[PDB]
Design a protein around this ligand. Structure first.
Ligand SMILES: *C(=O)[C@H](CCCNC(=N)N)NC(=O)[C@H](CCCCN)NC(C)=O
Lengths: 156, 39
């Protein structure tokens, strides 16, 4: 199937009609998404099949066809862009200055952007166009809004 | 059974809509990969 670099919708026909369950990134022949989008299940790409290769529930990440390839990191200073791919709608770039998740094991960039469930896995980009993490694992805060970590894997 | 469909290139857009604030939150990450707010 198609393996061109880019952003992809993750779809299913198990429910009524076709439903977008998430989003992911194809880079260097590897498909990258958030664990909770696929639960680590095999995927179809056209006539081909993508098998899971690496994943971790706690990081909430999974890669298909090879190891995690995305290694860019937020510089902690500059605005970034969410390349949001909402269900039934065209891909769109939203620019923002990340906040910070403060944890016992260090700080993580976080974006205060609120998109529906089907957009989990959408990439967050730096100004060079490199993917610095995926959108869709985060917190609901008091004001009802959603704040997503900038979740990035490790390239071995 | 899930399938993927291409939705575009991954590129920075020069004149993108700017939105969102920059909250600084203390969070905890549990073994199930869920974030929670600590206070
Ligand atoms: C994608 O699946 C969604 C994107 C956020 C939609 N919610 C909203 N805009 N309020 N992500 C989730 O629903 C997260 C699932 C993470 C599961 C990790 N084990 N939920 C949260 C709270 O981030």
């Amino acid at each position: 199937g198609e393996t061109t670099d880019g952003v992809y919708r993750v779809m299913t026909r198990r429910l009524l009609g076709s439903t977008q369950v998430g989003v992911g990134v194809m880079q260097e022949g590897v498909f990258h998404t958030m664990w909770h989008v696929t639960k680590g299940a095999a995927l179809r790409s056209g006539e081909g099949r993508l098998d899971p290769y690496w994943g971790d529930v706690k990081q909430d990440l999974v890669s298909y066809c090879g190891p995690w390839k995305l290694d860019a990191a937020w510089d902690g200073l500059s605005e970034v862009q969410l390349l949001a791919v909402p269900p039934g709608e065209r891909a769109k770039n939203i620019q923002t200055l990340p906040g910070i998740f403060k944890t016992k094991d260090g700080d993580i960039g976080a974006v205060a952007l609120d998109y529906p469930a089907g957009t989990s896995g959408s990439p967050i980009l730096d100004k060079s166009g490199r993917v610095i993490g995926l959108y869709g694992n985060g917190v609901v805060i008091k004001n009802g809004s959603y704040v997503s970590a900038i979740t990035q894997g490790k390239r071995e | 059974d899930m399938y993927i469909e291409r939705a575009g290139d991954i590129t920075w857009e020069k004149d993108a809509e700017v939105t969102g604030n920059s909250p600084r939150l203390d969070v905890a990450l549990d073994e199930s990969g869920d974030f929670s707010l600590v206070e």
